[PDB]
Design a protein around this nucleic acid. Sequence first.
RNA 1: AAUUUCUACUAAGUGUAGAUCGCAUCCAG
DNA 2: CTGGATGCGTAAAGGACG
DNA 3: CGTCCTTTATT
Length: 1202
Amino acid sequence: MSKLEKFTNCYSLSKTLRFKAIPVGKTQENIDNKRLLVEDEKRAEDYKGVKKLLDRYYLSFINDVLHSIKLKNLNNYISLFRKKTRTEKENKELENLEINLRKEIAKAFKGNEGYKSLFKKDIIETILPEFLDDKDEIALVNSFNGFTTAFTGFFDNRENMFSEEAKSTSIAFRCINENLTRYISNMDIFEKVDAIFDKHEVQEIKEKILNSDYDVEDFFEGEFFNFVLTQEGIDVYNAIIGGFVTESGEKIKGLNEYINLYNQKTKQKLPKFKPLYKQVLSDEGYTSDEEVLEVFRNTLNKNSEIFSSIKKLEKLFKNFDEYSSAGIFVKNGPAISTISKDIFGEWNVIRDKWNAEYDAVVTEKYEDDRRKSFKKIGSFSLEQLQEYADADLSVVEKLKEIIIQKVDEIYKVYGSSEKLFDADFVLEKSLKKNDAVVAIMKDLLDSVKSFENYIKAFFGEGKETNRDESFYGDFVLAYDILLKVDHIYDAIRNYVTQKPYSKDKFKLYFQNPQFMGGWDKDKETDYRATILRYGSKYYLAIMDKKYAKCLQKIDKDDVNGNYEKINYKLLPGPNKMLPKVFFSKKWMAYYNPSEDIQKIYKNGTFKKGDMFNLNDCHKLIDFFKDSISRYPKWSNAYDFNFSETEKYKDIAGFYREVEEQGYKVSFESASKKEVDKLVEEGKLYMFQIYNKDFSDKSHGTPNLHTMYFKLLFDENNHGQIRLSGGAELFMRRASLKKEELVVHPANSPIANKNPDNPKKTTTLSYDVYKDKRFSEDQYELHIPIAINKCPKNIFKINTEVRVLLKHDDNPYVIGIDRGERNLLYIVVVDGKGNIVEQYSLNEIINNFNGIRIKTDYHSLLDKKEKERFEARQNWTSIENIKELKAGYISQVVHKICELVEKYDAVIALEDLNSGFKNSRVKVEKQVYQKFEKMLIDKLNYMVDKKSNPCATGGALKGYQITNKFESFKSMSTQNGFIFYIPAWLTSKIDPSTGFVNLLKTKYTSIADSKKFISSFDRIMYVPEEDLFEFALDYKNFSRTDADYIKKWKLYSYGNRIRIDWEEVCLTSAYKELFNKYGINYQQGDIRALLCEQSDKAFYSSFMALMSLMLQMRNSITGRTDVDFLISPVKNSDGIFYDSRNYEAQENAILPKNADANGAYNIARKVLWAIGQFKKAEDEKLDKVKIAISNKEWLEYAQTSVK
RNA sequence: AAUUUCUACUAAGUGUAGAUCGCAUCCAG
DNA sequence: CTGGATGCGTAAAGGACG
DNA sequence: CGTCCTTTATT
Ligand SMILES: [Mg+2]
């Protein structure tokens, strides 16, 4: 009984193995003399070119077929599409109609005579040259005759367009699922908005745009859709909506603009047309220090056009008073928070002064319709914002001082940069070497980018009642010039942040269009590439075109050394292969196949479905079984051993046995003397398939991919991992010069970087070079493998994880959470919620031999954040930090995998589509998304390198506890062993009681502060404890639906940390507050006395004292020692929860700090969901919904503690 | 600071530890 | 540019060409 | 013929 070991051999998946290919002997010499690499480097260039010309014809072919087309179902479909109350049968109707619509478009394409030619040899030899009218381009296409097969891959990518399936890549799908669906929505909107378009306004568009061949109304009748299948039609349709610009240049207004005026001017909100997407084929970064520099000077010198539009926006905003403050608007969003702060000094005072009208009891259904109508508003006028501005304070004047301040900042930064704009300037050093220069370009770009990103607030997305077009005329003119800095900012950053070496490579073919197609022994002379072994070394051996068969003559050499030559036999895809061979002109003539059998095949009775006869299919199988035996190229390759034919449920049952039997990999001896001569003579080329684990100097643990690669040829690997074909060989030209490499000169000591390494220094007898691998041309070889090609353990992984979980008695849960002090914190939990382990992942501990050496990745991040502060916020340090986090998580994966294996444990992770990230946490959402993706990926085939490959857990019996990754949005609910959970109420919650603080203690009014103090059942001093007790029933406060217990007794126990920061003893600070106002707190219930008091500074000291008692988390920033979590509520046994009582302990039973509490409670939510699985019938486990609500959660946390 | 590649390294001396699905294509803001 | 999605990860029939 | 490039078959 293990959950894990039920999950081996579940599904098949592809991986690519990558290797340096090192030439051997004369190989590189012979390759240089024959000038082969040049030919390839050119070919790749020319190939990209021809693909574009090919596309040109493809694009012409598509318009021909789309123009012609006339869709049949249309009206009928649109109508059913529109029905808002469809019986399920009617939704199936609607699908069949949508399928038929797509099949119409597909059949329109594939039914040409022209179609089969597009992806055959013919398109390059004859069609494209006739089509083209340039002599150069025709020469390019001509260069590829006898090399058509190299286009197959591209051909497959273009085929996806002509599909009828509902797939992103399809033309049908783009027409029927995306563009038709929009057209229909626009019809809907049109009949609502039809009348407002002025009689005159419409006739404009029919002449200026439509050219008087169709009426504007035509474009909103269903039956007229066919017109907008083509990119041309779409260009028209979108022009009607967006507006056009004629040959003359006269602006012509579009329907969507007219609507904008009407809804603006009458303070209304009618809807607007969506434009149609483009059709599927219709129509880069900076490459050198000089090009980057040149752009910086040309777009941003003092007489560039962007600088001109700054000078104009200075004059416009200097004249801010001269304009109407009721027709100037500020878009709603982040810019409202910012501009609120800029002029009041307060983020949420502008929030308040429209809360001043809207604002007293708060049911959350009224609080959402509160908080939502809020978000509905589009913008605010300078008049409305002055309606909020207390008298004596001019909103327009202080805005003028802020905007004008930002342009003086730009001009000041221009004078510090002036020498970069001299026509006389030349660059001393490379930019990545020249920090001075880049920081000069950054500083200017920033100040321009902040001015730009600030000013952008003055839009209002309007859609806006009468706008000061005297202001927006000059503003829009000049802002559209200013927004060009955006592109220029990105591309110049992306450049400085790039690496100094390039990975640019190109594909080698060795003059063979199907080069290295597959490893099959028979196809070995066609592909001209095979694999050799000698001892622990593996080589790629490539026959030269003029000596294809040169390896076929070589015999085993008894006396001398021998190579091992691979002997590989694959039957690829019996469902594809078995028919082609046995119904081929060649074989069909040899083997009379009865009219039954060809009927069965032509008819399709063997294929499951309604046409299926188990007997017909059974007869086809014995046809295939005899032919295979009459076909000795298979029957003698694979010792075939089929199941008795009566036992097959379907054809796929037989095929699956062929597929698994039809793979064999062995080795043959081949004379090492004879093969080496071939290489010298230039008849064979030889590369060692190499990575660092094959070095004579390597010791200790190989890369996982080395192990996979070796296991391919191991006799304990029985198909678990197949060597696939379609490997590629590439040359990556060097991108660095040895002389310009950083060298650590031999025999001088080098300073070690890791503070936790005892050894502070290493001295080597040899030189070591930074980025050495890129100072040299490198061959790289990519080998695709096939894991679990024939899976036996077929079941839906999640349903199986739910069954095992339900019937598992003590299910363990690894909870992972992101901390502020801790990059990641781990809490392992048992089936009853006892903390088994709990620790931080700030330090990664690497083990080699019996030694351990830890690397504190929290120290590393802290030092790279300091280095970010020094040198402003340099572009690169941001990247270094991004990459460092990116590598951190790949250490963490290993640890999580260990925990899974050790505890047979499910994983509880944060759902990143629902929750809200606090940004106190170091590992931002983006990086964590990457981590959850990596985790899914590893667990498709989770292996322990250090295990025996044949053991479960090993490289041949990898655990498959995760379904193949799809999309970030799909990282929700559950994926096998990984459960995604909302982080709500996982941190700030008493792990000992389930208590959370559902009170709002923000002070507003003296009256509000009274109703609060009266809503408590009791407020008293307790002398025998020296504590103030605040008994409540959450019934009496608003927004407390989620709590389950409801009646709590708060105490002012222990201290808190107010936020600079002061420690506050709670008990004595209440005494202090009450004594300040002559309140006798010892007199039983005190609630009347506090409400008797009439001083507002009493209530705000009290609400602040309530805030502190309910702030369970207390933290001092920079002080990693002080992250304590302390409860105001007593548990079953009348003890308060204080986290520090457990951080002390070595094996604690409750969370040791705030971060620990986070992880713990995320793992408990999974425990709740396992609770649900145990409540459900086995058959209905699929149906159980995992998403735990706040209401369900608080119930679980408040009842499970006991 | 060496790498199929990436991060962290120097890990006891040309390397250590973990990770590592390639290639092509299309579509989106 | 980076996530979304597509597809290939093949031996053997078949043909052009000298 | 041979040899090299192209095309084929799909649960
Ligand atoms: Mg290693």
